[PDB]
Design a protein around this ligand. Structure first.
Ligand SMILES: CCCCCCCCCCCCCCCCCC(=O)OC[C@H](COP(=O)([O-])OCC[N+](C)(C)C)OC(=O)CCCCCCCCCCCCCCCCC
Ligand SMILES: CCCCCCCCCCCCCCCCCC(=O)OC[C@H](COP(=O)([O-])OCC[N+](C)(C)C)OC(=O)CCCCCCCCCCCCCCCCC
Ligand SMILES: CCCCCCCCCCCCCCCCCC(=O)OC[C@H](COP(=O)(O)OCCN)OC(=O)CCCCCCCCCCCCCCCCC
Ligand SMILES: CCCCCCCCCCCCCC(=O)SCCNC(=O)CCNC(=O)[C@@H](O)C(C)(C)COP(=O)(O)O
Ligand SMILES: C=C(C)[C@H]1Cc2c(ccc3c2O[C@@H]2COc4cc(OC)c(OC)cc4[C@@H]2C3=O)O1
Ligand code: SF4
Ligand code: SF4
Ligand code: SF4
Lengths: 185, 82, 52, 43, 115, 156, 114, 318, 176
């Protein structure tokens, strides 16, 4: 696309989360399978997710501004997270029993082929595994949300908005401040 | 609730939990409006924070006559035994 | 299931008939009366006709 | 002229009254039928 | 044996008309379609509040009249005995005690409802 | 192909089962509730088509917005529509539900129910006749008949 | 200029009723955030109640702030009882509007509005 | 071949229920000066297939506040107790020939309340809980005569076997010695089975749907064809109790046709009482089965206890 | 000139008291209701076979709008804007200019059918019978802007339905 349309604005979102995402709802749909298995305890990968209202404001402020011709933006969240305490923060906002266990690097793709045998929308695959366990690179030489006049919204304001659906009734209306914030890196 | 030392320390602690009061100029004889630089609404939520922690309700006539932490600890000393 | 207090909140169908009447002529103000008591249409037509 | 008018002799009279025609048996006859049903069943 | 096979088959295709009903359509669930129903607007409070029973003396006395048909029930068998007048007397005595109980609940404002 | 033929027959089957048993919900608002009742009357009779009322949103296929959508009952209509299971349809009945109608310029009318809910059939009138409302339901059936659910499912 | 009062004789009772109304809102806001299960915190709601009280903080007429206490108590009466909904509470929080440009050059750019 | 014996029972009383929905809609249509469904198939004979296929592909909608274990356990138990109450009914020979089949029917009539009851509790709503405790208020009303009328009608049968009851009524219908018990049992069965004038838990006017206002399709089909299975089973039960037909042991098909058409006429009687009557306030349900039906039920119980001793007509227990 | 509903003191002889006791115990009025319902069971119901049959109407009926024409091809709308001055919904937008032969004709005749109240002040205020509210009621849509009729769609309705609208006005113009 860069070599066939030279003024194309190419935008890099890291890991978008919303009400209809495949990132936080994905992390809240492994109370069905077992105890949310992770590669190498999920401690060797670092993420920074960005909220979809900020990415949409960035795309529209890229449409409006003629300073976006040929650029290459990089939309990232303001706070970086490890994967393990991210999943533990999701299961603490969702107020679920969290018991993690490491599934190894060679046998978790064999569970990844167990779900991609479906003609439906498959539940998970080894590609989603290789993307969750791919850490978010930091690109300082590329512009972001602050180079479009967009203030990035952090995760602790909108994870409750995403994850109020996945709660049981016994903690259905627990407040936003009734959870511990995760550990940024 | 027993002695004025612990009551005064609890007043100053509830005051320094409030993120607009500077703990540097906050004394027992510092003034809220013209010296700490607070609105009336700031003073009224200070009074309601004291009603939460101390656990008794102060009416409106004697929640405006509290213009320094000395007056707060004195009025709590009037509404208690000590 | 015994009834202690009934409080009917109304105005879920409030459309502002008698403000739209002030900005239209009399012949234009008639078809609001079809739509007030919409099972007593020509009655309200007759009442507004007797008023005018 | 040629206008919508009623006919010259008027219309027929229109009934507008209650007509609940009082059908059914008496009370004693219904209890007689019921007690006869019980006695035949018991025999 | 065969009764348990019949009951298990009934439970089987009473839950296999359920498991073919959940996984069959496309579940598109978002956080309003599973909200509680209070005829359009939002519900006031929870539904697990104390929901007061006005028909409570009738609901107690239903138990004491349902023990009666743990007592009155062997009468199609007690009619087969050779101590007949005592059976007749005790049967009419139990239905009479039920009737005295029902009339005492009648007259002393029991079968009416409170409030 | 052969699997394409199977999913085409299954599309015909399930779209037939969804169009020949439309369940509207008892949702009147204004004068069009009278004509919606007359579409349920003995003369025009929705239920000969397999079309019967169910008052709960959990057990209804279509919501006929019969009447005026004011500014005080926008969230009630939206939550009533959102509590309907998929597939759900909306037949916008009458002029106030279509585009505000006779109270379009007024302060307390949502100018068309398409602002609040997605609308599949627009039935124009003030009120549209119960025969024309029945024609709107039949055009909804002609919209459900040409759904292509499992064809697009197999071709994705 | 000799008119009939509503509740207050002068600004002392008027500030008393404004102050008691704000006391009521500060007591109430956690219940509002809880039962409407809003995605906001208690701090942002109390900031909004502060903004709504400082929006009208220039009145010197006792009857006008008497009616403002009356309208604030009607808002309180419809907030404590669940007569408002999630939308009616969140209409104070202008989340869906485009942010209105305040300076002169952007207002010059986007339209004819002074 | 007992498995095929069960599957020739329970699937046709999943088809009789399905086309009973068509009979209900069309009889309720012509009794209300309209037509029923006749566009779907030839004169409606493919309507219940459409209503069946439509619901099971509609989104199941587990509620976010509901107790999901009880919420799924309740319609399974509803359709289970709809199916398992056909087995002691003599058709003319029952599938399971119990010595005490009538108490089996009565105890499963007591148990089938809990599906409605747990469905109204577990579906965490206000209307559902109103419909659950009104089912409590309905069952404490009909169970205080559904046992004594059933007791007094089995003082002329001989035992609690439903196969004995055909031998009992060989001379005359048992409606002739017990028409007050028949006309009181019939209303006990209308209050038992949530048909109008005793809907009250499917009450579309006071509530929206009562207990199943939260049950979306999929599980709502298993209250649809549970409740109508209850009404066909209860018409056949009152048919065997009061209208037992001529049984020839060499030709069971004559009796099967005869009680089929009698139970069809009583099912049309259900759909025809639903087609004409207003609905009780749910205390007048309770002020009927306690203030009007229960004293006369005790009186007729005394009469049917003391009457075979008065006439030497004590039935055999064999 | 007035009557008392429900002021019937009942008879209290043993005959009528026994009759009402049998009416209570043996359910007489319930059998009366069952008899009336069974008597409407055995009729021909009034369900008409739509869409192969249609509902009865009259030539005054007010449905989908149309612009008519003279019997020489020239359109009737001489752009005089009474129909937007009387339209209670203000659903009609008219702009005009002198065309090539100098005749006063429209260039914009919009009728917003989702504003229109179908009351026919336009077809009775038009001094040349240009705008008429035709007999078409089966003109439902699937998209909202399809019900925003401009001049072209109204001329197409007029040319499409003129064989019916001209006969209805021919049958009705003596009552107006
Ligand atoms: C007792 C009476 C009922 C008996 C059971 C039902 C009888 C008919 C059985 C087949 C019905 C069709 C499948 C269920 C309905 C699916 C509707 C649907 O949403 O389809 C699109 C869906 C998904 O399509 P999609 O992936 O494009 O998603 C569209 C929906 N969004 C985008 C919102 C997520 O199709 C399926 O799920 C396929 C269903 C199974 C295909 C056949 C399997 C073998 C059957 C033998
Ligand atoms: C099983 C085969 C079919 C059975 C019959 C099927 C057809 C009949 C059903 C018709 C439709 C009913 C639909 C639901 C109706 C609900 C209302 C209802 O039932 O109300 C009950 C009504 C209630 O009456 P009520 O509520 O109007 O009572 C008046 C009360 N006050 C004054 C306070 C207002 O009637 C009964 O309860 C009657 C009970 C049964 C009567 C049996 C009488 C036996 C007589 C024996 C002889 C007596 C003579 C003296 C002694 C002689 C001794 C030898
Ligand atoms: C105990 C007794 C219980 C009885 C229960 C059932 C009662 C009703 C029985 C069915 C009554 C008739 C139903 C007819 C359905 C329509 C059949 C048909 O011809 O459909 C035409 C359609 C399109 O075909 P096309 O090639 O376009 O031809 C049109 C010509 N221009 O082609 C199609 O739609 C495809 C073919 C569909 C065939 C469907 C047949 C009916 C299925 C009903 C289920 C029950 C089966 C029978 C059970 C009893 C007998 C064993
Ligand atoms: C959850 C969100 C719900 C939001 C609800 C919004 C409620 C809005 C209520 C509005 C009521 C009013 O505006 S009355 C307040 C205006 N009063 C005045 O201007 C009189 C002067 N007021 C003042 O000087 C005030 O600062 C004080 C607090 C009374 C005293 O300050 P000074 O003394 O130093
Ligand atoms: C069930 C059938 C066959 C009929 C009856 C009926 C409907 C559809 C909708 C409704 C309805 O009746 C109820 C009660 O009566 C009115 C009367 C109304 O106005 C007189 C009114 O106006 C909004 C609304 C309503 C309800 C309403 O929404 O179809
Ligand atoms: S579109 Fe008009 S006639 Fe119809 S309900 Fe609305 S106000 Fe009444
Ligand atoms: S019928 Fe429609 S277009 Fe004509 S005047 Fe009335 S509202 Fe306006
Ligand atoms: S339609 Fe008739 S009234 Fe309207 S501008 Fe044209 S000629 Fe005049």
């Amino acid at each position: 696309v860069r070599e066939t349309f030279p003024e194309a604005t190419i935008i890099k979102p890291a890991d978008i989360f919303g009400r209809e995402d495949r990132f936080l709802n994905y992390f809240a749909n492994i109370r069905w399978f077992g105890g949310v298995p992770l590669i190498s305890l999920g401690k060797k990968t670092v993420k920074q997710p960005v909220y979809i209202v900020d990415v949409t404001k960035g795309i529209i402020n890229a449409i409006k501004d003629p300073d976006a011709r040929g650029k290459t933006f990089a939309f990232v969240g303001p706070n970086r997270y490890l994967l393990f305490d991210l999943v533990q923060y999701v299961f603490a906002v969702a107020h679920r029993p969290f018991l993690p266990y490491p599934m190894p690097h060679f046998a978790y793709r064999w569970i990844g082929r167990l779900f991609e045998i479906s003609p439906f929308e498959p539940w998970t695959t080894r590609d989603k595994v290789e993307r969750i366990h791919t850490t978010d690179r930091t690109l300082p030489h590329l512009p972001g949300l602050e180079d479009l006049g967009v203030q990035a919204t952090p995760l602790e304001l909108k994870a409750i908005e995403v994850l109020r659906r996945h709660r049981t009734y016994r903690w259905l209306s627990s407040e936003i401040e009734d959870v511990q914030p995760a550990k940024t890196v | 609730p027993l002695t004025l030392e612990g009551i005064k320390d609890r007043v100053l602690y509830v005051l320094k939990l409030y993120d607009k009061i500077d703990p540097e100029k906050l004394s027992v004889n510092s003034h809220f409006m013209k010296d700490l630089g607070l609105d009336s609404l700031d003073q009224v939520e200070i009074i309601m924070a004291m009603e939460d922690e101390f656990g008794f309700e102060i009416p409106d006539i004697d929640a405006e006559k509290l213009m320094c932490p000395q007056e707060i600890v004195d009025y709590i000393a009037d509404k208690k035994d000590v | 299931e015994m009834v202690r207090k009934c409080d009917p909140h109304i105005g879920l169908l409030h459309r502002g008939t008698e403000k739209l009447i002030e900005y239209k002529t009399y012949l234009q103000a008639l078809p609001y009366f079809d739509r007030l008591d919409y099972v007593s249409m020509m009655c309200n037509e007759q009442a507004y006709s007797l008023a005018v | 002229v040629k206008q919508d008018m009623p006919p010259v002799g008027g219309y027929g009279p229109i009934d507008y009254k209650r007509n609940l025609p009082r059908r059914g048996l008496s009370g004693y006859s219904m209890f007689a039928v019921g007690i006869g049903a019980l006695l035949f069943g018991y025999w | 044996m065969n009764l348990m096979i019949t009951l298990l088959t009934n439970f089987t295709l009473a839950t296999l008309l359920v498991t073919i009903a959940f996984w069959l359509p496309q579940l598109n669930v978002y956080s309003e379609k599973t909200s509680p129903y209070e005829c359009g607007f939002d519900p006031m409070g929870s539904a697990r509040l104390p929901f007061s029973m006005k028909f409570f003396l009738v609901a107690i006395t239903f138990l004491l009249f349902d023990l009666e048909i743990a007592l009155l029930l062997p009468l199609p068998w007690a009619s087969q005995t050779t101590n007949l007048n005592t059976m007749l007397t005790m049967a009419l005595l139990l239905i009479f005690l039920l009737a005295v109980s029902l009339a005492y609940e009648w007259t002393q404002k029991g079968l009416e409802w409170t409030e | 192909s052969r699997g394409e033929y199977v999913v085409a027959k299954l599309d015909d089957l399930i779209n037939w089962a969804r169009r020949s048993s439309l369940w509207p919900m008892t949702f009147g608002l204004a004068c069009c509730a009278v004509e919606m009742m007359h579409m349920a009357a003995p003369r025009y009779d929705m239920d000969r088509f397999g079309v019967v009322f169910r008052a709960s949103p959990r057990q209804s296929d279509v919501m006929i917005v019969a009447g005026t959508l004011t500014n005080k009952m926008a969230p009630a209509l939206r939550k009533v529509y959102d509590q309907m299971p998929e597939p759900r349809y909306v037949v916008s009945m009458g002029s106030c539900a279509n585009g505000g109608g006779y109270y379009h310029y007024s302060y307390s009318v949502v100018r068309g129910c398409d602002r609040i809910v997605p609308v599949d059939i627009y039935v124009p009138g003030c009120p549209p006749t119960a025969e024309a409302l029945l024609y709107g339901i039949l055009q909804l059936q002609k919209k459900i008949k040409r759904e292509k659910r499992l064809r697009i499912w197999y071709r994705r | 200029t000799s008119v009939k009062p509503i509740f207050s004789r002068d600004m002392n009772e008027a500030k008393r009723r404004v102050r008691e109304l704000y006391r009521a809102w500060y007591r109430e806001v956690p219940n509002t955030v809880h039962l409407f299960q809003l995605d906001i915190s208690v701090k942002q709601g109390r900031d909004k109640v502060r903004e709504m009280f400082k929006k009208n903080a220039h009145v010197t007429d006792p009857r006008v702030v008497d009616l403002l206490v009356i309208k604030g108590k009607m808002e309180l009466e419809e907030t404590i009882n669940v007569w408002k909904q999630r939308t009616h509470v969140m209409r104070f929080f202008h989340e869906t509007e485009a942010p209105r440009p305040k300076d002169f050059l952007s207002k010059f750019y986007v339209g004819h509005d002074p | 071949m007992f498995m095929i014996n069960v599957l020739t029972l329970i699937i046709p009383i999943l088809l009789a229920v399905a086309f009973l929905t068509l009979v209900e809609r069309k009889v309720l249509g012509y009794m209300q000066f309209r037509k029923g469904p006749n566009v779907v198939g030839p004169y409606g004979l493919l309507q219940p297939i459409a209503d069946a296929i439509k619901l099971f592909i509609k989104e199941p909608l587990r509620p976010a506040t509901s107790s999901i274990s009880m919420f799924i356990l309740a319609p399974i138990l509803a359709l289970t107790l709809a199916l398992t109450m056909w087995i002691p009914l003599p058709m003319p020979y029952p599938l399971i020939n119990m010595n005490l089949g009538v108490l089996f029917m009565l105890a499963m009539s007591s148990l089938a309340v809990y599906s409605i009851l747990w469905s109204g509790w577990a579906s965490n709503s206000k209307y559902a809980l109103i419909g659950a405790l009104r089912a409590v208020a309905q069952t404490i009303s009909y169970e205080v005569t559904l046992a004594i009328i059933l007791l007094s009608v089995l003082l002329m049968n001989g035992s609690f076997t439903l196969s004995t009851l055909i031998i009992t009524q060989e001379q005359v219908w048992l409606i002739f010695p017990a028409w007050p018990l028949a006309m009181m049992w019939f209303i006990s069965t209308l209050a038992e089975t949530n048909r109008a004038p005793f809907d009250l838990t499917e009450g579309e006017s006071e509530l929206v749907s009562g207990f199943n206002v939260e049950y979306a399709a999929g599980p709502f089909a298993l209250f649809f064809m549970a409740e109508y299975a209850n009404i066909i089973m209860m018409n056949i039960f009152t048919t065997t109790l009061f209208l037992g037909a001529f049984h020839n042991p060499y030709m069971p098909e004559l009796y099967t046709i005869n009680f089929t058409i009698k139970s069809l006429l009583l099912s049309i009687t259900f759909l025809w009482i639903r087609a004409s009557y207003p609905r009780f306030r749910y205390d007048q349900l309770m002020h009927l089965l306690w203030k009007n039906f229960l004293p006369l039920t005790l009186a007729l119980c005394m009469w049917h206890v003391s009457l075979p001793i008065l006439l030497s007509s004590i039935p055999p227990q064999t | 000139t007035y009557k008392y509903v429900n002021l019937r003191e009942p008879s209290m002889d043993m005959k009528s008291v026994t009759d009402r006791a049998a009416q209570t115990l043996l359910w007489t009025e319930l059998i009366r209701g069952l008899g009336m319902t069974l008597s409407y069971l055995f009729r021909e119901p009034a369900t008409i076979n739509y869409p192969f049959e249609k509902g009865p109407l009259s030539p005054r009926f007010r449905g989908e709008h149309a612009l008519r024409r003279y019997p020489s091809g020239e359109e009737r709308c001489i752009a005089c804007k009474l129909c937007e001055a009387v339209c209670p919904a203000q659903a009609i937008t008219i702009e005009a200019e002198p065309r090539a032969d100098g005749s006063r004709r429209t260039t914009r005749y919009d009728i917003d059918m989702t504003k229109c109240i179908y009351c026919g002040f336009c077809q009775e205020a038009c001094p040349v019978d240009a705008i008429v509210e035709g007999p078409n009621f089966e003109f439902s849509t699937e998209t909202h802007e399809e019900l925003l009729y401009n001049k072209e769609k109204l001329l197409n309705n007029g040319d499409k339905w003129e064989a019916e609208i001209a006969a209805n006005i021919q049958a009705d113009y003596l009552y107006r």
